[PDB]
Amino acid sequence: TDSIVKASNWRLVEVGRVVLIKKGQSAGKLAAIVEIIDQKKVLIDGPKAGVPRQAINLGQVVLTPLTFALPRGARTATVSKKWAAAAVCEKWAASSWAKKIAQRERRAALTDFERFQVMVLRKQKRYTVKKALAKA
Amino acid sequence: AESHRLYVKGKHLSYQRSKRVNNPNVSLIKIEGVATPQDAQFYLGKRIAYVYRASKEVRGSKIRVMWGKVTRTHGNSGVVRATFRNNLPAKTFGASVRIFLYPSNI
Amino acid sequence: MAHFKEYQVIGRRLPTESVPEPKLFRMRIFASNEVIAKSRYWYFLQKLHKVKKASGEIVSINQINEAHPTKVKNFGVWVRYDSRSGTHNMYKEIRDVSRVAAVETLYQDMAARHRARFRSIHILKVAEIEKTADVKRQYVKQFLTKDLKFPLPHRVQKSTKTFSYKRPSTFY
Amino acid sequence: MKYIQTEQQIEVPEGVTVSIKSRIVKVVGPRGTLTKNLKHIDVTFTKVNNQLIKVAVHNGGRKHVAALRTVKSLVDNMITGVTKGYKYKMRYVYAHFPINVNIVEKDGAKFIEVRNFLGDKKIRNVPVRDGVTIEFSTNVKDEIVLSGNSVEDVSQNAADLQQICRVRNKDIRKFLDGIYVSHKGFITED
Amino acid sequence: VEPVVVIDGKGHLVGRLASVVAKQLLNGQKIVVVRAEELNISGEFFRNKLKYHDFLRKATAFNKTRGPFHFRAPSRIFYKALRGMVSHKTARGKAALERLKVFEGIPPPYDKKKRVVVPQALRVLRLKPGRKYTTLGKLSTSVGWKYEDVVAKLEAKRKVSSAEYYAKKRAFTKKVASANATAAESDVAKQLAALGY
RNA sequence: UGCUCCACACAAUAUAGAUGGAUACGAAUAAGGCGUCCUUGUGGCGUCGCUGAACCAUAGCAGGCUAGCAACGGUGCACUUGGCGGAAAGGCCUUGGGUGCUUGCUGGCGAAUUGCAAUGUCAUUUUGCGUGGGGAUAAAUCAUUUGUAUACGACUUAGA
RNA sequence: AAGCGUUCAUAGCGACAUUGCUUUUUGAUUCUUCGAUGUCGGCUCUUCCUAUCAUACCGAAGCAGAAUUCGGUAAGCGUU
Ligand SMILES: [Mg+2]
Ligand SMILES: [Mg+2]
Ligand SMILES: [Mg+2]
Ligand SMILES: [Mg+2]
Ligand SMILES: [Mg+2]
Ligand SMILES: [Mg+2]
C-alpha cells in the first residue's frame, strides 16, 4: 500500500559539518567546515580545539554525524561562539565513537602494574559472568 | 603462564642488495609489529638471535644460535638492517629470528 | 615547488651618464624561490624592453602574501601557453583561498588537460572575480549555489594491515 | 566535468506501490507486478511524498548522468506498464504469398507459427516470453497484437517476430514481404 | 600473525591479491586461498576473454605437450598469476610456492576456519565505481573449466550448513553479551572502566 | 620365529623454521550488521562501524608443597550417550558419571651460588632396536606356454 | 575531389596533387661467412600469414529475377 524506499542517509559536506582530523598537525581534533572550496577541498576551523583556519583536503578528514547552525564563510570568532553555544564538544564526547577513541588512548597509557590489575580484575569479572551462563 | 616470550618475533627477509648484487654482510629483518621507521628506532642496537637445531650435539645441546644486532632502519616500513657475527646462511630467508629487549634504555 | 610564491621583482636598466635614474620596471612573478623569480623576471623583460641581465639591475625582491589567506574566493586567470603546434590564449577559473595556490592548481590543470609544462605557460593575469555572476564557468558556478550540500559516497578506508578480518564496508 | 548533483523525479499514480531495495525496483499496480534489477548504475533512490520518488547522482560525469535519465525512464515504463499496459500492433505485408500466422503449442511454450512466408516451406517459430499475451484482432486484415505488462518483454517479442521474417538473397526494397511493427501503445488508453 | 592465513578469494582483484600473496609467501607466511571462482579482474568479460585467447594460442610449435600449459581452473589461473611474481625456478621460490594452497569453493578443513580479506586487493575498495570487471568463474568456464556447476552446488550446500551455524552462534552471543551487560555497574566492572577495559 | 597394529623405553635421524589462540554466516558496498517490536515486510524503531589498537586467554619451583573460605561454576584427562559432517568427510556438536586443577577470595612453607648475559635447551617428523598385549597366515617375477601382440622389452592367454 | 557515371563527385570509378604500408621484385650497401653455411628448378611433406579465389553468415548497388560488382567478420576448410 505504501511506497517503501530505503533512504540511505549520508554525512553531508556542508557549512557547520563537524570533522575529525586524522592526518596533520591536528590529527585527532575537531573542526567545523566553514566553506566548501571544491569537491575535494573545504575550509575548516577548530578554534576551541586549536585547529587554525585552513584549507584542507577531504581525504585527510573524517566527517562526523555532528552538525550545528553556522553561516557560510563565518570567521573564527563567529565559529567559536556557535561551537560553544551548540555544545559540539559535549555531543561528540558522549558518542560511542569518541568513547572508543578515549578507550584506545586509555589502554595505551596503561603501565605494567595497571595491566596486571586488569588481568586479575578481568578474571574476577568473568567468574561471575560464566556462572551466570551455567545457572541460566 | 603459557607465554614466556621476552623477545619480539621477527622474520629474516633477505640481504642488503641492489637489483642484481647482494651484500651478505647485512641482513634485512622484519620486526613483527612495526610498520614505520620511527617505530624501528626503538629497536636500534637490540640483540637479535637466530635459533636453529642440529642433529649433532655440540656442548650438551642440540640447539645453536647466531647473534646479531639491529644497526639502522631500512625503507619506510619498519624493516631494519642487521649485522650478525656470522652472516645468516640465506636459506633462513623467511625464517624466524628473536629480537630481544636488551640492551635496554626503556 | 612545494608551494608557489608570488614576488614583486622591480628592476631597471643600468644608469648611464646621459640617462641616470631609469624607469624602474616592476612585475609580479610566480616562482618556487627567489632565484627562479629573478630568472623569470628577465625572461619577460626580454619580451618587452631592450634590456638583459647584463645591461640591467634588480633593485627590489619582495615576497607578496595574501591579504586574506583564509577566505575562499573565485579566481579568474588568463594564460597564454604553447601547444605542440601553436600558441593559444585561454581564460580559466579556480576556486581557492590564495593566488599562489590557484596558480598551483592552474599549473596542474594545464599539465593534466593540455600537457603544457611550466616551461610553456605565460601567466597573463590572475584576477579574483569581485562579484558573483561574472563567473563564466559551470564548474565554478556550481559551487556558488545557495545552501550547497553534497555527500561523499563510497568511502575507501586505508588499512594499516595487509590482512583484515571483517570484509569492510564503504558507508559514510 | 563532474556535476555536484543531478536529479530526476519519478511520479507515482495512486494504485502503484514502489518499493526500492538496494537497487532492485519493484512496481506493483493493477495489472500485476514488475520487478527490475538496477545494480549497475550506482544511483540513490529517495521518496518524497508517496507519489513522487527521486533518483540522484552525486559527483557524476557525462556518461553517468546520462545513465541517470535512463533509469528514470525504466522506472517510468514499469509504472506505466502496470497502469496503462503495453500493447503492440503489427501488420502483415506480402506481395504474392499470404502469410499464415497461428499460435500453436509444443510442450506449453505457445510459439508464433509463421507459414508460407514468401512461399517458404520452412516453418517459422517464435516463442512467447512469459508474461506476454498475443491475440489476432478483427476489423483489420492480417494484423497481430502483442500485449503485456512490461514494454521490454513485448517490444522484444515484437522484434523477435519481425526479425524472423527477414528476406534473404533478394533486393529487400522490392521484396518488402514481412511482419512489421505498425503501432506501439498501451492496452488502456481510451 | 596467524600460523596459516586463509583468504576468501571472493571480491578480490586477481593481480593485487597475487602481489600480496607472493610477498606473503616469500616472507615465510603460509597462505590458503579459497573460493577462487569468485575472484575478479578489471575490464569487461569479453576483453579479458580475448586476453586469454591470445595466451591460448602461444605454444611450442614442434610439440604442444612441452609448451606453455594453459590451465583452465580459476584456482590455477590465480596460481598462474602468482608465478611471475615469484622466482619459481629457484629453491627459495619453490619453498615459497609450497606455502600456498589455492582452492575452488571452500573445502574442509577450511569450511570451519576463519577467513580474511585483503583490503588492498578488494575490488569494491579499489575499482572506481562504474568501471567494468570480470569474474573468474565465468572466464574459466568460457575457456573450458568444467566444474562451475559442481562448485556452486557444493558452495550453496556449505552456506546452508554455515548459516545455521551462525544461527546458534547469534543465540549464544546474545546470552554471553547479556550476562556481561548485567555485570556492568558492578564494583569490578567500574574499576576496569577506569583502566580502559 | 617372518609381517602388521597398540602402548612405552633407548639410540639415531632430520626440520623452508611452534615459542598464548588459523578466533568459521551469507550477500551488499549509491549499503549493511546487531537488538527489539509488529500486521511478518524490499517493515518500523534504536544502536554500531570511522578497523584486529579487537576478542578470548593470560599470576603460581617453564609454574612447586600445603591450609581454609565462597560457589556448584570454569578448564584438562581418559571413559562415555546420541547426532551430524564424503569437496580433500577424518572434524563438529552433544550426553552422563569419575578423576585432577582452579589465580573467585584469604593464608603458611620453599626457590638463592646459572654467581652481572650467553637459545640456556621444554617441539614434531622419520628410522632402527627392545619389552609386553592383539591380529592375519599372500603373491609377483624369471623359466615353460598362447598369438587377439610383437624389432627387443612390452602386451594378451594356459599350467599343481 | 576537377571530372566520368542519361541527371548524380563519392553505386562503381576518379585527374591534378598528397600521406602511407610491405619486404614475395629489382636496385643500393658490403655488416657476417672465402682453414667452404652445398647453388637453380621440380618432386615430397608440414606449418604459418592474410593483402579472401571458393565455401559460412552478412551489409551496399546504377540489387525487379537471374547473373554480377563493391564491402565486412572470417585463414575453420579447400584451391586440380
Ligand atoms: Mg631477497
Ligand atoms: Mg639495500
Ligand atoms: Mg538477413
Ligand atoms: Mg539475386
Ligand atoms: Mg634461465
Ligand atoms: Mg582480413
PDB file of C-alpha atoms (C1' of nucleotides) in Angstrom, chain F residues 66-129:
ATOM      1  C1'   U F  66      50.161 -27.256  51.978  1.00  0.00           C
ATOM      2  C1'   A F  67      45.653 -24.700  54.961  1.00  0.00           C
ATOM      3  C1'   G F  68      40.975 -22.798  54.660  1.00  0.00           C
ATOM      4  C1'   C F  69      36.612 -19.622  52.656  1.00  0.00           C
ATOM      5  C1'   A F  70      32.937 -18.686  48.826  1.00  0.00           C
ATOM      6  C1'   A F  71      30.458 -21.194  44.818  1.00  0.00           C
ATOM      7  C1'   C F  72      28.390 -25.545  42.071  1.00  0.00           C
ATOM      8  C1'   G F  73      30.921 -22.922  38.445  1.00  0.00           C
ATOM      9  C1'   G F  74      35.437 -22.841  34.686  1.00  0.00           C
ATOM     10  C1'   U F  75      39.081 -25.953  32.405  1.00  0.00           C
ATOM     11  C1'   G F  76      42.004 -30.502  31.461  1.00  0.00           C
ATOM     12  C1'   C F  77      42.415 -36.089  31.294  1.00  0.00           C
ATOM     13  C1'   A F  78      40.891 -40.643  29.786  1.00  0.00           C
ATOM     14  C1'   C F  79      35.979 -43.317  29.762  1.00  0.00           C
ATOM     15  C1'   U F  80      31.226 -42.467  27.726  1.00  0.00           C
ATOM     16  C1'   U F  81      25.455 -41.221  25.389  1.00  0.00           C
ATOM     17  C1'   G F  82      23.465 -39.510  20.830  1.00  0.00           C
ATOM     18  C1'   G F  83      23.578 -36.984  16.370  1.00  0.00           C
ATOM     19  C1'   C F  84      25.772 -34.594  12.256  1.00  0.00           C
ATOM     20  C1'   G F  85      29.851 -33.883   8.517  1.00  0.00           C
ATOM     21  C1'   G F  86      32.147 -37.539   1.727  1.00  0.00           C
ATOM     22  C1'   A F  87      34.501 -31.258  -1.882  1.00  0.00           C
ATOM     23  C1'   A F  88      40.056 -33.158   0.385  1.00  0.00           C
ATOM     24  C1'   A F  89      34.414 -36.226   5.063  1.00  0.00           C
ATOM     25  C1'   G F  90      38.799 -37.646   9.425  1.00  0.00           C
ATOM     26  C1'   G F  91      36.292 -32.925  12.177  1.00  0.00           C
ATOM     27  C1'   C F  92      31.995 -30.548  14.690  1.00  0.00           C
ATOM     28  C1'   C F  93      28.218 -30.582  18.304  1.00  0.00           C
ATOM     29  C1'   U F  94      26.436 -33.332  22.378  1.00  0.00           C
ATOM     30  C1'   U F  95      25.135 -36.713  26.880  1.00  0.00           C
ATOM     31  C1'   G F  96      26.454 -38.941  31.790  1.00  0.00           C
ATOM     32  C1'   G F  97      29.485 -40.097  35.631  1.00  0.00           C
ATOM     33  C1'   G F  98      34.670 -40.421  37.522  1.00  0.00           C
ATOM     34  C1'   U F  99      39.349 -38.233  38.474  1.00  0.00           C
ATOM     35  C1'   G F 100      42.614 -33.732  38.832  1.00  0.00           C
ATOM     36  C1'   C F 101      43.499 -28.408  38.845  1.00  0.00           C
ATOM     37  C1'   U F 102      41.463 -23.640  39.921  1.00  0.00           C
ATOM     38  C1'   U F 103      44.641 -17.256  40.344  1.00  0.00           C
ATOM     39  C1'   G F 104      36.997 -16.311  42.614  1.00  0.00           C
ATOM     40  C1'   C F 105      38.929 -14.714  47.797  1.00  0.00           C
ATOM     41  C1'   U F 106      42.289 -15.257  52.409  1.00  0.00           C
ATOM     42  C1'   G F 107      46.811 -17.621  54.461  1.00  0.00           C
ATOM     43  C1'   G F 108      51.607 -20.521  55.537  1.00  0.00           C
ATOM     44  C1'   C F 109      56.346 -23.078  53.526  1.00  0.00           C
ATOM     45  C1'   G F 110      60.106 -23.478  49.514  1.00  0.00           C
ATOM     46  C1'   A F 111      63.231 -21.104  45.479  1.00  0.00           C
ATOM     47  C1'   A F 112      69.360 -18.350  46.293  1.00  0.00           C
ATOM     48  C1'   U F 113      75.845 -19.841  44.083  1.00  0.00           C
ATOM     49  C1'   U F 114      73.041 -20.450  36.256  1.00  0.00           C
ATOM     50  C1'   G F 115      77.498 -16.129  40.642  1.00  0.00           C
ATOM     51  C1'   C F 116      76.063  -9.059  36.157  1.00  0.00           C
ATOM     52  C1'   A F 117      74.028 -12.041  29.732  1.00  0.00           C
ATOM     53  C1'   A F 118      75.120 -16.351  26.818  1.00  0.00           C
ATOM     54  C1'   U F 119      68.569 -20.455  22.611  1.00  0.00           C
ATOM     55  C1'   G F 120      70.238 -21.513  28.221  1.00  0.00           C
ATOM     56  C1'   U F 121      67.581 -26.458  25.663  1.00  0.00           C
ATOM     57  C1'   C F 122      60.524 -27.737  27.080  1.00  0.00           C
ATOM     58  C1'   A F 123      58.885 -29.099  19.536  1.00  0.00           C
ATOM     59  C1'   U F 124      57.184 -32.681  15.793  1.00  0.00           C
ATOM     60  C1'   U F 125      58.994 -35.841  11.801  1.00  0.00           C
ATOM     61  C1'   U F 126      61.455 -40.199  10.208  1.00  0.00           C
ATOM     62  C1'   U F 127      64.041 -44.613  11.301  1.00  0.00           C
ATOM     63  C1'   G F 128      66.205 -48.804  13.802  1.00  0.00           C
ATOM     64  C1'   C F 129      66.419 -51.874  18.429  1.00  0.00           C
TER      65        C F 129
END
